[PDB]
Structure formats: structure tokens, C-alpha cells
């Protein structure tokens, strides 16, 4: 198919893997533990 075979392969793959490493570091260090802080806080007020 003509449209998914251009010269832009390295473009696609470069910004894609930059976004993957970005979201991986970003999710893992920032955004998943900001939910888990809510979890441990709710359970800590629940246990008291």
C-alpha cells in the first residue's frame, strides 16, 4: 500500500520510541505513584 511505505520510517519510529521512553519514565516515576499515594492515604485514614 502506497501510504504506509514512505521515506518517513525513521521519523515515525524516532518520535514513537521517544514517546515510549518518555511515557515509560513519566508514568512510572510520576503518575502511577501519585495514584498510589491516594491509595495509601485513604487506607491510612481508614486504619487510623
Amino acid at each position: 500500500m502506497p501510504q504506509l511505505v514512505p521515506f518517513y520510517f525513521m521519523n515515525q519510529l524516532t518520535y514513537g520510541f521517544l514517546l515510549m521512553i518518555t511515557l515509560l519514565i513519566l508514568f512510572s516515576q510520576f503518575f502511577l505513584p501519585m495514584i498510589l499515594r491516594l491509595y495509601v492515604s485513604r487506607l491510612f485514614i481508614s486504619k487510623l
Binding site: 500500500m1 502506497p2 501510504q3 511505505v5
Partner: protein, 75 residues
């Protein structure tokens, strides 16, 4: 040069028969899902991931045939 495009479009037509092997596939999977939920109402939250898994992991074999059809049509 007309023969190449002609047999190209004929082969792209031939390579969509395999989707009847996926329609019946999704059918039998959700049919067993219905018969399994109906005869045991507490198994839904255990059998539903296997249902979705079997659904898409069976379609994939019709979508391979559709990609052979797309590589014929447009490539």
C-alpha cells in the same frame, strides 16, 4: 500491463473469502460465552477476559487475510 493489474484485482478479490472463517469464529466464541453465563451466573467475571481474548485472538486470522488483500489492492 493490463494483465498484471487484472490478476492483481482478482487475487485481491479471492483473498477476502477468509473472513467467513472469522465471522463464524466470533460467533462461536460469543455463543459459548452466552451458554456459559446462562448456565452459571457467577462465572461472568472470570470467563469474560477469556471471551475477549478468544474473540480478538481469533479475528486476527481473518485480518491477516485482509492484509494480504490490502497488499494486493494497493501494493
Amino acid at each position: 500491463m493490463q494483465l498484471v493489474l487484472a490478476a492483481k484485482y482478482i487475487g485481491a478479490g479471492i483473498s477476502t473469502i477468509g473472513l467467513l472463517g472469522a465471522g463464524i469464529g466470533i460467533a462461536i466464541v460469543f455463543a459459548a460465552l452466552i451458554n456459559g453465563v446462562s448456565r452459571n451466573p457467577s462465572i461472568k467475571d472470570t470467563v469474560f477476559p477469556m471471551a475477549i481474548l478468544g474473540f480478538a485472538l481469533s479475528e486476527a486470522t481473518g485480518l491477516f487475510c485482509l492484509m494480504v488483500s490490502f497488499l494486493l489492492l494497493f501494493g
